Design a protein around this ligand. Structure first.
Ligand SMILES: [Mg+2]
Ligand SMILES: [Mg+2]
Lengths: 275, 8, 98
């Protein structure tokens, strides 16, 4: 189906001593493929997926140079933003940035994004037109005028629509054995009595990829949300994801209840009933 | 492949 | 200003006596500084690793902490989390059914 490349950057100031903690991660779809951590020893961009390891020295040198540049820009911004908000030098603050591009099934550019936050709140973001800026407050408005004057959106648009998608396509090809493979959820139902006349049915979806999934309960063929619990989709730790949905039912009435599973790796949705 | 800056 | 959500779980369906991976997934929190320990019978497990810090669209952070472990009938596992938003450490016990 469709695909994305995304990078995430976090800088956290350290008022007591030294420079901010800086962590950057890159993803293709739901697969992390690179990382940089200012606390780590290498001080280089590092691979985190097999299909990126084939990239040569020129690649790693450039990604390292670029990611360090991001870190220094963030470091300066922490100082600037402290000033904009008239904040003390005593507190720790955070800058977050994320950017990426999406492509469709034909691998053609679909959309781009580039957004920036201070202390966990929207600060400034590129609009979907890749031309305009959303500034959340008057400090961000100051930044917006600066970025207009510096032709920032133009450069970002060029990257997002061109370079970003070109390299995404490259990665999709090189890592095709996993990146272009869907892993359908392995599903089963468990049963846990909660009294001598009621029980929890838990519908499990395991080892799936990508993370996107829908789990729903029906009772007698109609959606049921009352007396249900749905946990947030969670990483298994091996590149796949997990989720479950549960419903409390009167014991003996389990057969009324069906769990429905929708996932990209399933040609048709699955239906489960307590066995 | 990272983007190749303007400060806040 | 935003408190961590916590799920503690195994990578694979648990079978007593069979090696597995114990996960503690913390999400929805801000700021990013956080203390996460995995516990075996109340004691800190030493060899614990975690994923590289990332975040969701609402800017809240998430991390996966993990270590190898072997479920048994007698051993109790848990995740212990402290964060600026918490007045005291929050302990969530591992339940193999969740
Ligand atoms: Mg420096
Ligand atoms: Mg412009």
């Amino acid at each position: 189906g469709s695909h994305s490349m995304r990078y995430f950057f976090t800088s956290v100031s350290r008022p007591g001593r030294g420079e901010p903690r800086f962590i950057a991660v890159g993803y293709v779809d739901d697969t992390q493929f690179v990382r940089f951590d200012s606390d780590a020893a290498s001080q280089r961009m590092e691979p985190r997926a097999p299909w990126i390891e084939q990239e040569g020295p020129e690649y790693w040198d450039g990604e390292t140079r670029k990611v360090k540049a991001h870190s220094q820009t963030h470091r300066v911004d922490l100082g600037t933003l402290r000033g904009y908000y008239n904040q003390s030098e005593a507190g720790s603050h955070t800058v977050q940035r994320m950017y990426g591009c999406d492509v469709g099934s034909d691998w053609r550019f679909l959309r781009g994004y580039h957004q920036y936050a201070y202390d966990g709140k929207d600060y400034i973001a590129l609009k979907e037109d890749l031309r305009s800026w959303t500034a959340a407050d008057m400090a961000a408005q100051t930044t917006k005028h600066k970025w207009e004057a510096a032709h920032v959106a133009e450069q970002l648009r060029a990257y997002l629509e061109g370079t970003c998608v070109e390299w995404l396509r490259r990665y999709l090809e090189n890592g095709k054995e996993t990146l272009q493979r869907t892993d359908a959820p392995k599903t089963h139902m468990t049963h846990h009595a909660v009294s001598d006349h009621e029980a929890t049915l838990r519908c499990w979806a395991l080892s799936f990829y990508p993370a996107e999934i829908t789990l729903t309960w029906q009772r007698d063929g109609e959606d049921q949300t009352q007396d249900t619990e749905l946990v947030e989709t969670r990483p298994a730790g091996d590149g796949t994801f997990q989720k479950w949905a549960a419903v409390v039912v009167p014991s003996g009435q389990e057969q009324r209840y069906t769990c429905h599973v929708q996932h990209e790796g399933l040609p048709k949705p699955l239906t489960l009933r307590w066995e | 492949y990272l983007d190749s800056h303007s400060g806040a | 200003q935003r408190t961590p959500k916590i799920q503690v779980y195994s990578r694979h369906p648990a079978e007593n006596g069979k090696s597995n991976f114990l996960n503690c997934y913390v999400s929805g929190f801000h700021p990013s500084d956080i203390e996460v320990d995995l516990l075996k019978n109340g004691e800190r497990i030493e060899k614990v690793e975690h994923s590289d810090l990332s975040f969701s669209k609402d800017w809240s952070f998430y991390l996966l902490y993990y270590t190898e472990f072997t479920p048994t009938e007698k051993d109790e596992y848990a995740c212990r989390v402290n964060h600026v938003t918490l007045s005291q450490p929050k302990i969530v016990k591992w339940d193999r059914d969740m």
